[PDB]
Amino acid sequence: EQEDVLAKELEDVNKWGLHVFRIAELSGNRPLTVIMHTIFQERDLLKTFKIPVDTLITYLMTLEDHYHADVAYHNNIHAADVVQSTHVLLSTPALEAVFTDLEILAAIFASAIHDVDHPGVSNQFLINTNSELALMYNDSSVLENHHLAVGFKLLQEENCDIFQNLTKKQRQSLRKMVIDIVLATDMSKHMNLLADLKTMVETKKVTSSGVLLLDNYSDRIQVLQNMVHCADLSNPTKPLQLYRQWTDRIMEEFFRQGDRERERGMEISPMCDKHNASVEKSQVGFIDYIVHPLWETWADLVHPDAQDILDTLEDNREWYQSTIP
Amino acid sequence: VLAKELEDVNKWGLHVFRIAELSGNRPLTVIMHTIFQERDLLKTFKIPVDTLITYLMTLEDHYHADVAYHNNIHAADVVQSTHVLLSTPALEAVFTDLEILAAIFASAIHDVDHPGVSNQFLINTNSELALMYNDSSVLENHHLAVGFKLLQEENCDIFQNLTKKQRQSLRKMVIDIVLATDMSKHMNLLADLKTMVETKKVTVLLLDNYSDRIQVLQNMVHCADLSNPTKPLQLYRQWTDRIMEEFFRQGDRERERGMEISPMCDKHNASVEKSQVGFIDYIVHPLWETWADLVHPDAQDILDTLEDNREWYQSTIP
Ligand SMILES: COc1cc2c(cc1OC)[C@H](CCc1c[nH]c3cc(C)ccc13)N(C=O)CC2
Ligand SMILES: COc1cc2c(cc1OC)[C@H](CCc1c[nH]c3cc(C)ccc13)N(C=O)CC2
Ligand SMILES: [Mg+2]
Ligand SMILES: [Mg+2]
Ligand SMILES: [Mg+2]
Ligand SMILES: [Zn+2]
Ligand SMILES: [Zn+2]
Prior knowledge:
Two copies of one chain form a homodimer.
Chain A: H1 2-10, H2 20-26, H3 31-42, H4 45-48, H5 53-65, H6 76-90, H7 101-113, H8 123-128, H9 132-137, H10 142-153, H11 168-183, H12 190-202, H13 217-232, H14 240-263, H15 279-301, H16 307-322
Helix pairs in contact in A: 2-3, 3-5, 3-6, 6-7, 6-13, 7-11, 7-13, 10-11, 11-13, 12-13, 12-15, 15-16
Bound molecules: ligand AKO (2 copies), magnesium ion (3 copies) and zinc ion (2 copies).
């Protein structure tokens, strides 16, 4: 019976606002596995790339295991949400037939691994505390390099190489695209990434069929980079009952980092002091300075495919603002 | 004795192989020690001389003695070459004492724990290093990580009496410098050096913002990394012998694995002399001529020796 209800909920996999928390509960805290498996079936990726079903499940379960269940936001539910949001963004009409199967596989795989083994603290916290991760990665995209290294390493575990039947050229291309995509999820690259997306929007070319014209790697990877970045920053664009749960979880994570910064005599990071935080004003500023500028630009790139998502974002911003006065 | 040769530490063409032999295979230590005294670094930064020695020894130990080129003698050579370039007249005290310390420390660690194979080899063999570093400046990220981690060994933190902000600043400059020694970044680096030359301002060089000053320091250590063909011929020839030995050993590993043999790495199909002339024509002379322009004309004798050495190598080709 519980499997039947889960199957009903997975019928929403192509919809923005999938009940991802319900799916995590109904799947036994396996949202990343079941949503990834569902999307691979939906896009015929097992047949296209000759991925053994048992190998796919084994990798997904291992990958999902390496997300921290004790981190409130950057956990396997977040990963599953970014995977499913990227899957929906890949289906946008303005991009129909634009990307190859290998690029679709790269974008979805990158989304699945993009936060694996996240410890629930920021890059700056890891740098400032002289963590082994920051020492390993020379303070440069510390978390994001780590997510990549773990996500690829787990392919080497027993019956986990889901890319075993790709050609060597296919594997090499996929690996580079996945690295390029996950490194672009570093928030310290957001401004430069949005600047380039804006440049592409103002110089955008479309084909005779009306889809976006991307005729070189730089343009192609930049669209996939911004797509996964939008998916990563998609919480305020979702139905409010989903958005508010994400806000609760990120604030829990922030406050826990602030508690450790406080116990260390460090200056507390912005939005991380539970004694002097405004959750509502922080969301309004997050939308106003980061999320709406990004999604407004994405919406321009794929116009008018994303108008409903942009409208939800604007409604939710009005709602969070309305709770301030 | 060893003290005799060390007095040339301020001279281009120091006898680093003799120093390496006379010092019991500790050229990096004794040359780093000597350079710190020459610049007054142990007192400028309150470095306990024993802590300096303990770190430098541990660092030297992490260079591989069985790697023919990228070993502790190479590290010593780049340290001393950078040291000399820091005293270019056109750069009179242009860098702060921390920027000086960062360039020298970066030089000393810039190849530590080098396995004697290229980044591309590590990528194509699915090495643990390339998996860790996502195929991006694999060696250079590792050199930095090792160089910094060794500061955490007992009595090895030579920066213990730097302030918190001095450490953070030094760390960033060292990382920026060592990452720029990746040879895949050479062309972008040269373009920035050229731009700086075409827009140079002078009284002596006037570099106002960090971005220009880190670029000079990056191209400086890059020059010191690529200085072998600008040294006296007797030193240059020993460097050529060592790099070709390391290249051929990589090409043998590529052959025993049946992978494609890297350029200049096929011992059954390599012209050592033509490779050197091509190396100078396409890489070393463009870089050192651009640098010579920047410090016009304080690099004249270095550019002269390079052109002398290129002529000699060309004359060995029938
Ligand atoms: C649901 O809500 C959130 C979700 C997320 C964040 C913040 C949220 O809410 C404040 C932060 C963003 C941090 C951040 C980086 N630069 C910024 C600049 C500004 C102005 C504000 C925030 C940031 N994340 C951290 O992993 C991503 C997910
Ligand atoms: C003494 O001589 C050498 C010393 C060194 C090298 C090559 C030497 O001699 C052929 C190579 C340079 C790699 C390289 C990158 N692009 C190139 C293009 C050309 C044309 C040649 C070489 C290179 N190194 C390897 O770590 C640095 C030291
Ligand atoms: Mg992340
Ligand atoms: Mg190197
Ligand atoms: Mg100034
Ligand atoms: Zn994320
Ligand atoms: Zn070197």
